[PDB]
Design a protein around this ligand. Structure first.
Ligand SMILES: [K+]
Ligand SMILES: [K+]
Ligand SMILES: [K+]
Ligand SMILES: [K+]
Ligand SMILES: [K+]
Ligand SMILES: [K+]
Ligand SMILES: [K+]
Ligand SMILES: [K+]
Ligand SMILES: [K+]
Ligand SMILES: [K+]
Ligand SMILES: [K+]
Ligand SMILES: [K+]
Ligand SMILES: [K+]
Ligand SMILES: [K+]
Ligand SMILES: [K+]
Ligand SMILES: [K+]
Ligand SMILES: [K+]
Ligand SMILES: [K+]
Ligand SMILES: [K+]
Ligand SMILES: [K+]
Ligand SMILES: [K+]
Ligand SMILES: [K+]
Ligand SMILES: [K+]
Ligand SMILES: [K+]
Ligand SMILES: [K+]
Ligand SMILES: [K+]
Ligand SMILES: [K+]
Ligand SMILES: [Mg+2]
Ligand SMILES: [Mg+2]
Ligand SMILES: [Mg+2]
Ligand SMILES: [Mg+2]
Ligand SMILES: [Mg+2]
Ligand SMILES: [Mg+2]
Ligand SMILES: [Mg+2]
Ligand SMILES: [Mg+2]
Ligand SMILES: [Mg+2]
Ligand SMILES: [Mg+2]
Ligand SMILES: [Mg+2]
Ligand SMILES: [Mg+2]
Ligand SMILES: [Mg+2]
Ligand SMILES: [Mg+2]
Ligand SMILES: [Mg+2]
Ligand SMILES: [Mg+2]
Ligand SMILES: [Mg+2]
Ligand SMILES: [Mg+2]
Ligand SMILES: [Mg+2]
Ligand SMILES: [Mg+2]
Ligand SMILES: [Mg+2]
Ligand SMILES: [Mg+2]
Ligand SMILES: [Mg+2]
Ligand SMILES: [Mg+2]
Ligand SMILES: [Mg+2]
Ligand SMILES: [Mg+2]
Ligand SMILES: [Mg+2]
Ligand SMILES: [Mg+2]
Ligand SMILES: [Mg+2]
Ligand SMILES: [Mg+2]
Ligand SMILES: [Mg+2]
Ligand SMILES: [Mg+2]
Ligand SMILES: [Mg+2]
Ligand SMILES: [Mg+2]
Lengths: 85, 274
RNA sequence: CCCAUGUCCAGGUUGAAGGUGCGGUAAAACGCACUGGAGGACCGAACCCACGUACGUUGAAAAGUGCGGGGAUGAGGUGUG
RNA sequence: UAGUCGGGACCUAAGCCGAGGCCGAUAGGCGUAGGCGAUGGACAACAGGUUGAUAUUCCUGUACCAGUUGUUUUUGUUUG
RNA sequence: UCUCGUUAAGGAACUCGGCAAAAUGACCCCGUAACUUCGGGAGAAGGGGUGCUGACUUCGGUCAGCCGCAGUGAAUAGGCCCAAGCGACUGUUUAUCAAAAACACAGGUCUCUGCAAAAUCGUAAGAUGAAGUAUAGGGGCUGACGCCUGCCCGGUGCUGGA
RNA sequence: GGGAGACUUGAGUGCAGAAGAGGAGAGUGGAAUUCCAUGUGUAGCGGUGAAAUGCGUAGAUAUAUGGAGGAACACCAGUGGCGAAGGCGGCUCUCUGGUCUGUAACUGACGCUGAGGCUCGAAAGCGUGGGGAGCAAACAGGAUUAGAUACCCUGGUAGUCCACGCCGUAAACGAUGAGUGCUAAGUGUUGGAGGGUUUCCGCCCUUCAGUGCUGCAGCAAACGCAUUAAGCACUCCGCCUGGGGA
RNA sequence: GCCUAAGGUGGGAUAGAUGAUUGGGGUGAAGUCGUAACAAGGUAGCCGUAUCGGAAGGUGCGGCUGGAUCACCUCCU
RNA sequence: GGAGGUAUGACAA
C-alpha cells in the first residue's frame, strides 16, 4: 500500500526527502517481505509469487551487506529497529 | 489432526490417533449426563443376540438435542466436547434463557457461534430448519424422518447429505450412502456436514485398543466345527466348500440382499445405493 | 462369557510425544542439550499362569510336589452381588 | 452384654419382583407405576482397665448424635 | 530305588535330541556386529574391577600398604553366538496326555444395512443392535509391514432384466 | 590491492503512468458428448479398403422435451501476450509476483557471475482420499495376414480430473549459459513515450522495451548466423577430449 | 615396582585369491525367426515414461522436427 | 519463390 509505504519511508528516512537509502529500502522491503509471507502461508501453492518473495529477500540481504560494509553503526541501529538477525 | 505414533513398541507400531485439537474441554455438563450400562450384546432374555460386543471402558450418556425444536432463542456454542457414545463430537450450547443442551458438532463449528432453529433461521452451519425452508443444493445433517421426532439420519463423523429438490410434501435428499429418497418436508435438518471428518483414518494399532472400544474378538466360521457354523470342519485349512459363503445362521454373506421386499419406504426411495 | 460394584500389582529400568534454551534460517525444515514421563515397554517378588524334567502312579494329591519355566499397568489378576 | 462397631428402622447399581397393562393352546411370557437389592453412597466416642471364657458392647475417665420434660434467659404472637 | 554332594584323564564320544546336569548370574566400568520398520538388534558379543587398613579427597575416585587358593569370599539375581522354517508382534487354547505353525489380533477386502436398519433371542408381546444412524451396525474371507495380487463369468451362486 | 574522501552514468528507491492466457483461492456460464426419463416413430443402426464383432422388435438409430454428471473452454486467436523455465486461453471476484515507459526527487557501485546448497520443474508413474462424461495403456472380441502378441474395427480397466504428499525425468530445444558494451540497412507487429500536422478520427517524424521477417560487414567445414549474432570484446559458471563396452 | 618388544585372546575394519551357481557384454567368411530403422521405409521418426509381447518392437500420454506430400493466412524477397 | 503455425536377397570379385 502506498500509504503504508510512505509512512515507513518517513519513519526511517535518513533525512528530509530521503526515499533511497539502505535504511529506507530495507525497512520497506521488510514490511513487504512480512506481508508476502502471510500471503505465502495462506497460498502455499502460489509458487510464482514465492519467487518474488525470494528476490525481495536477496535484495534485502544485499542492501544489508552494503550497509554493514559501509557503516556498521548504522547497520546495528537499523536491524534493531526492524528486528532482523 | 491425526498424530502418528513412533514405533517404540510393536503394539505402538503403525498406530495413529486423533490429537483432539478441536476438543476445548474435558468437563462434561453434569446436568446432561445419564447412566448407560454396557449391554454386551445381550437382550432381555440374557442371550447374546449381537456377537462381538462387551467389555471396554465405562461411559456416561450425553443427552443430545436431536430435535432442535427450541426456536424462540439462540444458543451460543460454549465447548466442543468428546462424546464416547458417537464418532462425532458434540457442542455444549447455552440458550439465552439459560437452557443448556448438547448438539452434534458440525464441521466448521466454533466456540462463540450463535445458532438458531426455526423456519426463519439463516442458512448457516449449525442452524436447524424444516427441510421445506432449506434451499436446494445445501449440505445438511441430522435429518429427522418424522416431524418432531428428531434427527435420525446423517449423524456419524464426517457424514453429510444434500438437498436435491422439492416434489409434493416431500424433499428429495441424497443421503451419505448415495441413496436418493424423499423425506417429509416438515422434517427438520441441520445445515452443514458432521465434524471430526478425520475419524475414519485412525489406525487402531493394537488388539487391546479394540477391546477398550467394546469390541470382542471375531472368530471366523472356517475355523469352527460343523456344529458351530456351516463353514466349520474339514481337515486342515479348507475353502468355503459350499455354493456361497454364509453367516453362522446360513444366510449368504456375499451379495444377497436382506431388505424387506415389501418395504413401505420403497415408494419413497428414488435411487438406491448400498 | 457377560453385567454392576469394589479391590490388587515389592522394587528397579528404559526414556515416546510434547515443552524450553541455545544454534540454524527471510521464515523454516532441521541439529544439539535440557526437561518431559509414553508403553498390550524392559528386569524382577507378591499374584496369575503351566514350558521342560524327575518323582509320584492301591499317590501326601481322582493331576500334585521338587528343581527349573512364562506373564507380571494389562486383551491383567481377584472379591462380592 | 453396644444410641456410637457391622446389618435393619437410610440410599440407590447390576439384577430381580411387579398393581393395572401388553402378549399368548393351557401353563404362562414380558413389562409401567411402585418396590426389592451392596460388592458402592450416607451415618454420633475414645483410651485404659477388667474375666477362666465377652468387650469401641462391661467398668473407669472423658465425649458425641437424635429426642423428651422442666427451670431461667431472650423475642413472636397472624404489617406474623 | 529316590533326593543330594564330590570325582582322575577325556569333554557330547551319550542320545531320536546335550534330555538331565554343568556352566552364566549381582553391581560398577571399557566396549559392543550383520541387519533394521531407524524404535531397535544390546544386558549383543568380548573384556576389566569388587576384601581389608591408613593417607588423601573434586566425595568418585586416587595413592599407598596388607592378607587369602579364592574379596557380589555365604544366600539369592542372564549361558552365549551363527543360520533355516513357521507365525508379524503382546495375547488366546484342548480344567485332567497337544501352548503350537492352531485361535485372536491391528491392517486389507467383499457384501449387506436409509432406520420399526440389516442381524439375532422370542409363538407373540418385548428385547439386543442403539438411547447407535452408512466415518454406523451385521456377515464372509484375508491377517502387522513392504512389494504385489495375473487369466477364465462356460458351470454353480448372487444381482439385475423380464 | 589496502586506507580516507568525492562522484552519478551501473544498480536500486521515490513519484507518475502502461499492458498482460503470470500465479493462488472461491464461485460461475454456455456449447457439446454420454447416461437417464418421457413422447413420436419403425427396421435397421454402427463400422471398413472391403467386412464382421457390436447395438436394435425386451422398440434401436433418428427426433422432441426435460434431468443428472464429468471434462474441456468454439468465435475472439494473431512468428499475439505473460512467465525463470516447466508453462498459462470461458467469465466474475479476493489475495499475489514480475515486467515495461516517462520523470530525475533520493541512495551513492549497494554490481555481475555463482561451485556447494536450496527452490521450482511437461507427461508418464507412485501413495492416501474423492471423482469418472469423453478418451484410452492393459485387456476382450472382430478383422488383416504366411504368422500379427500390430497397424484397422467394436468394446474397455488403470490413467487422464480434484485434494494432499512423493517422484525429478523429456528432441525439459533456439538441440545456441548468464551479464555488459560495441558493430550497415529494410519491413511487419505488441506495450509505451515525446513532437508536427490533422476539426477529431488519423497521419508524419523521434524514441524506449519486446516480438518476427529480409539482409551487409564480419563469422562459419558447410549449412547458415547477422543489434533477439553463431560478429567484435571483457567477467563468472557449466561442460567436451575417437567409437563401442556405458 | 612403572614403562615395554614379542607372544596370546577377542570383536571389528580393510586388500587379493578362490566358489556350486548366476548375470548382462564383446567376439566369431558364409545358422534359425521375423523385418524394427534408412524413401511418406510402406503405421513419419525420435525423446521421456508406463504397460504388453518370442524377438526386434507394439500401444497409451506428453513433447521435438532432427517431417514426406498436397491444401491455407501471415510474413518477406 | 522461401519462412515458424495447423516379406526376403551366400561370400569374394
Ligand atoms: K501395531
Ligand atoms: K468419540
Ligand atoms: K477373526
Ligand atoms: K478346518
Ligand atoms: K512340574
Ligand atoms: K448398631
Ligand atoms: K458396605
Ligand atoms: K563317551
Ligand atoms: K545377539
Ligand atoms: K585378589
Ligand atoms: K541375571
Ligand atoms: K500362531
Ligand atoms: K498375528
Ligand atoms: K508373511
Ligand atoms: K507358549
Ligand atoms: K486354537
Ligand atoms: K497384505
Ligand atoms: K470384515
Ligand atoms: K475365501
Ligand atoms: K478383520
Ligand atoms: K465363470
Ligand atoms: K455366472
Ligand atoms: K500487477
Ligand atoms: K493417482
Ligand atoms: K520493432
Ligand atoms: K515403426
Ligand atoms: K517445450
Ligand atoms: Mg462382528
Ligand atoms: Mg479346530
Ligand atoms: Mg451344518
Ligand atoms: Mg467346510
Ligand atoms: Mg488340504
Ligand atoms: Mg510388558
Ligand atoms: Mg518380568
Ligand atoms: Mg489366590
Ligand atoms: Mg488355562
Ligand atoms: Mg518377555
Ligand atoms: Mg451402617
Ligand atoms: Mg416381570
Ligand atoms: Mg397382574
Ligand atoms: Mg424404576
Ligand atoms: Mg459411623
Ligand atoms: Mg477370646
Ligand atoms: Mg570328571
Ligand atoms: Mg579334572
Ligand atoms: Mg553322536
Ligand atoms: Mg552312539
Ligand atoms: Mg536342559
Ligand atoms: Mg556370595
Ligand atoms: Mg505368534
Ligand atoms: Mg506369547
Ligand atoms: Mg491338556
Ligand atoms: Mg501341556
Ligand atoms: Mg488365515
Ligand atoms: Mg500427471
Ligand atoms: Mg537430461
Ligand atoms: Mg527490435
Ligand atoms: Mg519396416
Ligand atoms: Mg515405420
Ligand atoms: Mg522417418
Ligand atoms: Mg497391444
Amino acid at each position: 500500500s502506498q500509504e503504508r509505504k510512505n509512512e515507513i519511508i518517513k519513519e526511517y528516512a535518513r533525512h528530509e526527502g530521503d526515499t533511497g537509502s539502505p535504511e529506507v529500502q530495507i525497512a520497506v522491503l521488510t514490511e513487504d517481505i512480512n506481508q508476502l509471507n502471510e500471503h505465502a502461508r495462506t497460498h502455499k501453492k502460489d509458487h510464482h509469487s514465492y519467487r518474488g518473495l525470494m528476490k525481495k529477500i536477496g535484495h534485502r540481504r544485499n542492501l544489508l551487506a552494503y550497509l554493514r560494509k559501509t557503516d556498521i553503526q548504522r547497520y546495528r541501529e537499523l536491524i534493531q529497529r526492524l528486528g532482523l538477525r | 489432526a491425526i498424530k502418528k505414533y513412533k514405533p517404540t513398541t510393536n503394539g505402538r507400531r503403525n498406530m495413529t490417533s486423533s490429537d483432539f485439537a478441536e476438543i476445548t474441554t474435558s468437563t462434561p455438563e453434569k446436568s446432561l449426563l445419564q447412566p448407560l450400562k454396557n449391554n454386551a450384546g445381550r437382550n432381555n432374555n440374557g442371550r447374546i443376540t449381537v456377537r462381538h460386543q462387551g467389555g471396554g471402558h465405562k461411559r456416561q450418556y450425553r443427552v443430545i438435542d436431536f430435535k432442535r425444536n427450541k426456536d424462540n432463542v439462540a444458543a451460543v456454542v460454549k465447548t466442543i466436547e468428546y462424546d464416547p457414545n458417537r464418532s462425532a463430537n458434540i457442542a455444549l450450547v447455552h440458550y439465552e434463557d439459560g437452557v443448556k443442551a448438547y448438539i452434534l458438532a458440525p464441521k466448521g463449528l466454533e466456540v462463540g457461534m450463535r445458532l438458531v432453529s426455526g423456519p426463519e433461521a439463516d442458512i448457516k452451519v449449525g442452524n436447524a430448519l424444516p427441510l421445506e425452508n432449506i434451499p436446494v443444493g445445501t449440505v445438511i445433517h441430522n435429518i429427522e424422518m418424522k416431524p418432531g421426532k428428531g434427527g435420525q439420519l446423517i449423524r456419524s463423523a464426517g457424514t453429510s447429505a444434500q438437498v436435491l429438490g422439492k416434489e409434493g410434501k416431500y424433499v428429495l435428499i441424497r443421503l451419505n450412502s448415495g441413496e436418493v429418497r424423499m423425506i417429509l418436508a416438515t422434517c427438520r435438518a441441520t445445515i452443514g456436514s458432521v465434524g471430526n471428518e478425520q475419524h475414519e483414518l485412525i489406525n487402531i494399532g493394537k488388539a487391546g485398543r479394540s477391546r477398550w472400544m467394546r469390541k470382542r474378538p471375531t472368530v471366523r466360521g472356517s475355523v469352527m466345527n460343523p456344529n458351530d457354523h456351516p463353514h466349520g470342519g474339514g481337515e486342515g485349512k479348507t475353502p468355503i466348500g459350499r455354493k456361497a459363503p454364509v453367516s453362522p445362521w446360513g444366510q449368504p454373506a456375499i451379495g444377497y440382499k436382506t431388505r424387506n421386499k415389501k418395504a413401505k419406504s420403497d415408494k419413497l426411495i428414488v435411487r438406491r445405493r448400498t
